[PDB]
Amino acid sequence: GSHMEALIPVINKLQDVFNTVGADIIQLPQIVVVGTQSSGKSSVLESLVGRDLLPRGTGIVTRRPLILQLVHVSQEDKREAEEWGKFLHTKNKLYTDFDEIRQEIENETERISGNNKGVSPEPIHLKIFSPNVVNLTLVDLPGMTKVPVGDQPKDIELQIRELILRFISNPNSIILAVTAANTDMATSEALKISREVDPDGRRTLAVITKLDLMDAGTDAMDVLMGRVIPVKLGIIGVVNRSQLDINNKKSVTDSIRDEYAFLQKKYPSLANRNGTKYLARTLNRLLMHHIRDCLPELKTRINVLAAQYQSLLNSYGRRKEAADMLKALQGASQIIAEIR
Ligand SMILES: Cc1ccc(-c2cc(N3CCC3)c3cc(NC(=O)C(C)C)ccc3n2)cc1
Numbered sequence: 001g002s003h004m005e006a007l008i009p010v011i012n013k014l015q016d017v018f019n020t021v022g023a024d025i026i027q028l029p030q031i032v033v034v035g036t037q038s039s040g041k042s043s044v045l046e047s048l049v050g051r052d053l054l055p056r057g058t059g060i061v062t063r064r065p066l067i068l069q070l071v072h073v074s075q076e077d078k079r080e081a082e083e084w085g086k087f088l089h090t091k092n093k094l095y096t097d098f099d100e101i102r103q104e105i106e107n108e109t110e111r112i113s114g115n116n117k118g119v120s121p122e123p124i125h126l127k128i129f130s131p132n133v134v135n136l137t138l139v140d141l142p143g144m145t146k147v148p149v150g151d152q153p154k155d156i157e158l159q160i161r162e163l164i165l166r167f168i169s170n171p172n173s174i175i176l177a178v179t180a181a182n183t184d185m186a187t188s189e190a191l192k193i194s195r196e197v198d199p200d201g202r203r204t205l206a207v208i209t210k211l212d213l214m215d216a217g218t219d220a221m222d223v224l225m226g227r228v229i230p231v232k233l234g235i236i237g238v239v240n241r242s243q244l245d246i247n248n249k250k251s252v253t254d255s256i257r258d259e260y261a262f263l264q265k266k267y268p269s270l271a272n273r274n275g276t277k278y279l280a281r282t283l284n285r286l287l288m289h290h291i292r293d294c295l296p297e298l299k300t301r302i303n304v305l306a307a308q309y310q311s312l313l314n315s316y317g318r319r320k321e322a323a324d325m326l327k328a329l330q331g332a333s334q335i336i337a338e339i340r
Contacts, residue, residue, distance in 0.1 A: 002340045007291035008135050008284075012069050012127070013335055015137070016088050017328045020121040024166070025305065025325075026332070029294035030139055031287060032167045035178030035190045037143035040209035043240030043255075044178055045140055047276045048283075050132040051083075051098055051252050055106040062113050063142035063160060065123035065167065066105070070133040083132070088125035101126070119159040121166060134284040138176065141167055144189045161193060168197045172294050174233065174286065175204040181220050181237065182213045185229060194231075201231030205286065207279065208237040212262055224270050236282060237274045239263070299336045305329050 014028055035041035042054050045068060054066075075082055085095040087104060095101045105124060113120045119142060142160045147153040168175050175198060177190035185191070185208070194204045206229050211220050222228045224237050239259040241250055256276045263271040272278070306329040313322045 004288050004292060005135070006339060007288055007295065008137060009071075010335055010339065011291055012137060014332055015067050015069070016125060017331060020123070022325055022328060024170070026298070026302065027170050027172045029172045029287075029291045029298065030137060030170075030174070031176050031283065031290075032164075032170070032173045033138050033140040033176045033178065034164055034168060034194060035143055036146055036180075038146075038183075039143065039178040039180050039190065040240045041140070041143055041178045043246075044207055044209065044238060044279075045138065046252050047238065047240050047256065048133065048136065048138070048280050049128055049252070050130060050256075052246070053098060053102055053105070053128075055102055055109065056246065057106060057109070060109045060142070061118065062109055062111055062120050063118055063156075063163075064109055064120045065142075065163075066140040067123045067125050068138050068140060069125075069127040070136045070138075071127060071129045072133055072135050073129045073131055075131050077129070079129075083128070083130040085129070086127045117159055118156045119163050121163055134280045136280065136284050136287060138283075139167060139173075144193070146183075146189050164193055165196060168194065171203075172290075172298075173203065174290055176207060176283070177204050177231065178207045178209060180210045180213070181208045181223075182210050182215065185223060191229065191231070201229075201233070203233065204231040205233035205283075206231045206235045208235065209240055210242075211237045211267070212239050213242070220267070224267070224274060233286065234282065236279045237263075237267075237270070238276055238279055240276075295336070295339070299333075302329055302332045302336060306333055 011028055011030060014026065018026055033041060046052050046054060048070065079094055079096065081096040085101045086092065108124045141164050144160055145157055147157065167173060175194045177194050179185050179188040179190050194201065198204050208220055208223055214220065220237055223235055226235050229235055239262050241252065241255045245255060259275050263275050267274065306326060309322055309326040309329060313326055
């Protein structure tokens with residue numbers, strides 16, 4: 001078919017097929033989530049999933065990317081359960097218990113790295129099927145910590161920043177920069193590190209969290225009217241669960257009802273272009289458009305790489321790297337050709 005609706009599932013397959021080195025070479029069209037731990041980055045993800053999912057962990061032994069693939073289903077595809085998960089690493093094991101899914105994410109972050117570091121580029125590959133999600137994939141990267149002017153940035157913090165730079169240097173990456181509204185957004189760590197690859201914010205969309213927790217005598221009006229933050233793909237404000245709400249087991253679904261009430265109350269002029277449902281629809285539309293726009297460049301580069309890996313492999317008579325890569329490119333090429 002020619003469907004815009006087939007584009008996300010196609011890149012979903014290429015994300016499963018390529019290892020981290022392969023993925024760097026292919027430059028896939030995808031959204032990379034960049035923020036501080038204190039940005040509420042995690043609560044943005046859970047808000048799009050429609051329930052809690054991520055390890056509530058003080059510190060992570062080995063911080064890794066999460067490739068989170070959200071798939072919309074009808075209420076009549078029940079496994080019975082209307083919502084379930086799969087990981088690439090547990091093949092076709094279906095997960096109906098979301099606590100079990102969270103534990104499996106924690107388990108995978110407890111693997112010691114191939115090196116001796118608290119960061120690894122090896123992503124956790126998780127797919128969620130649900131009637132309550134839009135069709136959307138996000139590559140969530142380990143959160144930064146803002147280093148107070150004069151403090152010495154820790155080794156682990158430099159490693160988290162190198163990993164972010166590795167992912168967002170993908171020219172076909174869209175950067176979802178997350179910043180709390182209760183912080184100096186001019187000095188956002190998310191926006192600073194994004195400018196190291198995207199100086200004019202051409203491929204950067206800003207999410208502002210914690211609109212409710214702003215210092216009294218300040219508001220988000222200027223930012224949400226698009227007059228402050230230099231990015232080009234849009235500014236969306238959200239109100240997620242506070243660290244209190246989480247500790248109190250407040251549901252994501254109820255946090256969203258309370259978010260819409262707040263926006264309608266305080267920001268009625270802006271409510272229809274902000275909040276969780278609008279972010280979800282916006283990101284779905286943006287990713288579909290981005291993949292459509294990148295697909296011919298992707299198809300070309302996949303065919304040129306196949307020819308180049310075929311040629312290197314023929315040159316031999318190391319060979320395992322080349323051979324696996326060539327096999328993965330040949331599959332990628334066939335999957336892309338099934339479109340128009
Ligand atoms: C550590 C490490 C670093 C780099 C590679 C690597 C290998 C490549 N060759 C294909 C046969 C091997 C390669 C090819 C590229 N060609 C193109 O973009 C075409 C589309 C112009 C682009 C980047 C490439 N990078 C592998 C390991």
